[model samples]
Target: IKWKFLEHKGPVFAPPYEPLPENVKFYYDGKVMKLSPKAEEVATFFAKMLDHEYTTKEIFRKNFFKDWRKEMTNEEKNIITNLSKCDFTQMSQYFKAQTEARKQMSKEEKLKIKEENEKLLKEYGFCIMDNHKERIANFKIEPPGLFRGRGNHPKMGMLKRRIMPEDIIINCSKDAKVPSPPPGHKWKEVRHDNKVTWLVSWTENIQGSIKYIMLNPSSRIKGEKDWQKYETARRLKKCVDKIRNQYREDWKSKEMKVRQRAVALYFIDKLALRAGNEKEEGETADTVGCCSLRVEHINLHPELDGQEYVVEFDFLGKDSIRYYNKVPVEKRVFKNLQLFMENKQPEDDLFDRLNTGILNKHLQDLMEGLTAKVFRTYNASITLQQQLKELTAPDENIPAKILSYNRANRAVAILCNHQRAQIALGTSKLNFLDPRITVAWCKKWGVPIEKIYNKTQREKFAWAIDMADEDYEF
Candidate 1:
């Protein structure tokens, strides 16, 4: 497969900033207060702080205090600096004090705070709803908790969850009515739904958990039909092939980095893999592949068999055990990995040299939504359908056909590394009973058992298998 390197566009953002109300204050604790030129410069500096890299809580506190000391008033600065020394308990107390202060404020003061928050949302919030640019006035706040993966989440126990109101920005259409929570449920507030715009939310527990809500499955807004399922394998077979071919040509003339990227694209096409996210090697259990792979996860066995090379892969992938069969690879690509891994330790990244940002940037050149995971979804589904077509027998009865269908489903599940619980006794404990067992169990439970045969022979199997023997029958 050929691959092409795409130019990078830093980030996606909604066009045109919304205008704020004149009464909205930018500087005052509640409203934008007009500041002297020096204070304005300091405020601008603080605004820029939002773009800085602060991954740790300690780093965040240090940076927050340093910026606040330079930008805030004596009273405000004192409280901000003191926050640096405060633990989570102290921080919660301080936050509660502020919340209490809001509760005790006069009606006019409360209204003023609302107006200020409205201004902030207008300036920073994005609308993620269909087709309209809506400015949000109010939004719900959630406390963060752990993230749950459908199967296996690699970062399951390690990733912390933290959320705060300041992290969420709402974008709603001016005329769109706020959505109401169903009976017996409550939300902090309803704001405009912004599907098209980018919004950031913060959490207090960075590695502990994520914040989410469960909605009734049958609710119209939360119904299963609301979701769109696509055949990704067909899409990738169509889209990624073109990308692979294009980049392969690029490898002949481009820089080494571009050539390497092209090789990565080819690997992605042949083997569907997830878009690897960036993580500190030691901070998390290592996992990676063409564009992402941890050093310890892959082992190249060159002398084990008579063949020159075999890549032995045993790792936890997306929460499930992943075992890959070794196959031959291009000599050049293998050499590139050797070179890349020269100085790296086992706990280091195999593709620490590359990242998803770089990979996605290259994909954008091929087509829209050409993401890493799309390939996996596409291949897995297509493989199942193809396998089912081949395994199904034309003359099979319904029970036999159903059995074939289950086999096909099980094939896909095995390919995807989906584990099913073992059945105990004669019962289907894990919701998946083998066809033969199912038939026997049904008859034992008084279900009518049908025999598949020509019209004349039907009664023979029914009486012999399904019914009690005439000689010993009750």
Candidate 2:
């Protein structure tokens, strides 16, 4: 269900580029050189990131140099053949000075800028959806930059073209006052496509994919979706026993397809693995999930570290995060894995008979709203709920109780293989686990919600906070 009436001010475009001062010259072969406006803009992008590790990467430098050369004039291109000969130290220093100057600005000066930003937010950050004014998330169009994909992405250093009014598709109600484009500019299309949740969309040149501006997390539409996701996971809990039994039985099936599907589902259910989708070749980083697990990504050990039937998983997952684990499986599962591995190369797929589509289709038949990801949600939340009960003691102090809470959340993260290089656990807490479970846990323990949920998180899960009582269960 969607709103019949939607009205809003359109997105704010990125601020236009400001050219560098005359004294802040670019140097080529130790000689001061002038550049065309287009070349200057792209050069400045590279210059701003001079201090970043991205500049040191060979692939990034190659991609940026190739793209930058496209913007140079004929004369400039001939003169600037070597990237090594070009220097951006002057431009880089100029930006550094600008940053320091802004930081050192007077209190009144800072306050004036803050007020101006607030005014901009007031004018463009809200929309009237039905009877209520709702906040729009990311209403500003993303400015052009060097594309930075997580991990060692092939497309990392590609130029992201600037978005213009001509590239935007504005979606709203036909009866609502349509937003006007800037003077002498026209939107690509003004559409009354409220069926989609997005209010604004434009195709990004680097990835050739659509980017959307949608409602903020606090918005009713987003909150309802979040609620429904958890509800589906809760429903899955009811029938999971039967589903698990079915998959276990399928593991001994005569057909290879059935056996493969069964094993993939087993990994997803037991390990909380993602249903890996097939990404376009050479377009993105190499990552795999359960169905897409390559033979090289896992090792079968009849015995490992005093355990039998152990499967060692070592692969790059989403964002190229390493997922390494040693799990001991049942005897039948170990034997079935050997059958799948027979006559296959290291690079060949472990479950070539299965894919996400086939697996999800089978899942849908088993239970409504059942998908590989639902298994992740179900297991993550259930683990947290169980861990809280098992780890916490009634006599424990508030600090000890909070520690138990953190440990519980950490266990869920481990179960889902959610890893980061630095201290971070928001991925599972915010996106996977049902907030109501956490809220109820906090309420039961007399632990302040603030101790568990940060300000932004509290706002996002406002519904859960308001409705969940101590008796609430996942």
Candidate 3:
């Protein structure tokens, strides 16, 4: 049942930085300057970002400038303590020129580079697991650039270091013919760890976590578990009505824990909320939901704009993303809000007699295997299925169905948090929601499959694309 072999070209290395070109400069205390290698890299991270908006953010500027200065020499550090006084425009211009110059490079030069990448992709991008030559989601050994801090920045500007062979643990058959390390250095360990998912893994100081080089979803190890998550959603779907009834009954119970659990489910059903304990401690005492919700976050009005039993919420919902909404609820739901606030401060737990486990544990109990994200999984798939059924004319033309697909996805966005960013980030989306429905919906209806899946993804999903019909669901 095991894979016969594995081989690939090793990771591409980070280029050694060009030392500050003499004409291109850094300035400290309003004087032109050269920086030490370590300090120079620190400033380089900042210098690239100078023209970008996030560089001026209060927290990003605060942390990055401090980290940038701490790397400098006594003289460089002393005078440049004031970032407002520092200048790095020349460094920014140099990088900009270098990039623009690459873009302007001749076709022949670009062709040669593309040739090498195709060679690498042809050689390393595909590999063996058991049988059926499948594409490997390439072992992306990303060079530790300065981590950019977003408004929800998980790692606030941590400079992760580059990895070497010494840090790598390779997984291959010891019995495989000529299983040799690259010409010079030895891998940290060479074992046939058949049980684990990764081909290689490393423990890192920077993230304080284990990093891994893994196989694609093509593998039984990856896909088998994901298949179970799909079944989990199906399983949860059957019992959703039961869950609603149970929680609704919980709201009426005499027990405080039951009432709290019922109210938490209310927030979950209403706010699309996840359990707070699974995430961080949360925004502040004055936020809402299962964790950091405060009575202060809520305001009760017997009547607002002819609507009875209104509750208005305006508070910093995680990292100052304001969650402000006013809605009317049931008489009991309103009285529960008033009951929750009694003797509580402007900043106090709206309340939690129930812990995080109740939500996750109960849902997971319904789901035999994959406990996480049943609602998001089923909600997303069902949205597409329902939307397609509603919008599709009995004989809708191919182009007609294509535009309809966009609105279906827009509805899914609202289900997933609906926050719009001009840029969609390149974060991997697998467990949170399956990508199968949207991809198939487009292909079956007539849009080019490439419109949804990149060339890299198209291969892995060929099975799904070929298999799914317009009637097919994720």
TM-score against native, each model? 0.47, 0.97, 0.81
Tens-digit lDDT string for candidate 1 (1-474): 011111111111222223333332343332234443433333333333333333133434343445445545665554434542422332234435656888899999989989986765554343333443333222334322222222323333222222323333322344554333334544343344333222222333534433332222222222222221232234455766677668767555336567656656656655555566754644444445556666776677654577665555566565444546565665555655565567778877666546778887867667665676555555555554554456667666567765765676566454444544521221111112212232343343333444322332232222324333222111
Question: All candidates' lDDT scores?
Answer: 0.44, 0.91, 0.64
RMSD of 1: 17.5
Worst 10 residues of 1 by lDDT: 1-10
Model 2 TM-score, 2 decimals:
0.97
Of 1 and 3, the candidate ranking higher by TM-score: 3
lDDT of 2: 0.91
TM-score, candidate 1, is: 0.47
Please provide, for model 3 over 87-169, each residue's C-alpha lDDT reduced to its tens digit, 9 standing for 90 to 100: 88889888888889999989999999999889877775654555455555645566655666445464455566667777777
Q: Which window of ten consecutive residues has the lowest lDDT sum in model 2?
A: 416-425
Q: How many backbone clashes does candidate 1 have?
A: 48
Q: Top TM-score: which candidate number?
A: 2
lDDT of 2 at 100: 98
| Model 3 stretches astray by more than 4 angstroms | 1-10, 152-155, 172-191, 203-207, 217-223, 278-302, 310-328, 370-372, 422-463, 466-474
> Which 10 successive residues of model 3 have the least lDDT summed?
422-431
Better of 2 and 3 by TM-score: 2
A best-first ranking of the candidates according to their TM-score comes to 2, 3, 1
